[PDB]
Amino acid sequence: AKCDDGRTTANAACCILFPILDDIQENLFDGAQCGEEVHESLRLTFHDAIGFSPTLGGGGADGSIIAFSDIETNFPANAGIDEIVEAQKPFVAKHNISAGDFIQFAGAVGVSNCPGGVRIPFFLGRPDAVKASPDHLVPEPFDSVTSILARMGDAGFSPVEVVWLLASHSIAAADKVDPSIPGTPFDSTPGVFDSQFFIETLLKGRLFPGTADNKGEAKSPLQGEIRLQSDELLARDPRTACEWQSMVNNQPKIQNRFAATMSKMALLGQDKTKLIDCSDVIPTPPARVGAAHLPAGFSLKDVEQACRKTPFPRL
Ligand code: HEM
Ligand SMILES: [Ca+2]
Ligand SMILES: [Ca+2]
Description:
Blueprint: H1 17-27, H2 36-49, H3 64-67, H4 69-72, H5 82-94, H6 99-112, E1 123-124, H7 145-155, H8 159-165, E2 173-174, E3 184-185, H9 196-200, E4 217-218, E5 227-228, H10 229-236, H11 241-246, H12 251-266, E6 276-277
Helix pairs in contact: 2-6
């Protein structure tokens, strides 16, 4: 199909997305930055989608977190999500697009702003949400690996897919884990979609960036970085450690697996064959990304060698 843009897109329905793209790049993502709103919008994709269980219910990637915001944003596991929910509502209202579609579109567009980022497939056509998600479907940072793998598994994800999806924490920060230091990132490069998150979570902890004893928080290797207990544990657990290590310095794998698994996540509760492929609207991300490295001052002795099959690579 040809849009009024002049642009050719695979399916005519997708032409509606171009005005949406322009508006959100300016007015949601603050001049097309890989900044706070991108990070928040990416988190929203997960908090919407993961509300899906074959037995426990939930409609998955259905916009429920927006449509039923008073219910869902008050779930303890959704702490801090209301800000982005309320920021997205005026865009949904004016752009003739379901909340579920908008959440996934915004997430994909936002990731595309990040150097090193990847294009996530995007499908148009999710109906309006039917029902609120049940509570207790969103993993929390104080949950055990067993719990997280069971919940993610219930939703449809294998342990390696959980690791792949956590590449998201390469462009991510926390506001509520330690409320004394809002905006503290999970890696040294929160504006770059890269492997630093996988490296830095394997360093041996030295300090807390704010206060000690916050629920769900682990010791960090670096001032200005916060570490989740869940990420600390996933990096080290026999079920996930070797996959975690396999990401370090494998940018192409991080990109490829994140895109594929995000697409799967974006389609929970949905049927791709009933939706319209509009992937070609998502921009190409900036390609420049540097080599993976240990932070300044650190050496191999500072790396926890959790994977037993393979040593941590020379960077
Ligand atoms: C697997 C279990 C996971 C746990 C326990 C977890 C936990 C967390 C926590 C505690 C925060 C900080 C919230 C705050 O205090 O402000 C966070 C942020 C974030 N999460 Fe995860 N997460 C998980 C998986 C995911 C997945 C699968 C995605 C994929 C989209 C994701 C994307 C993000 C992003 C992008 C942020 C940063 C938000 C921002 O900076 O505004 N998370 N996550
Ligand atoms: Ca949902
Ligand atoms: Ca990063």
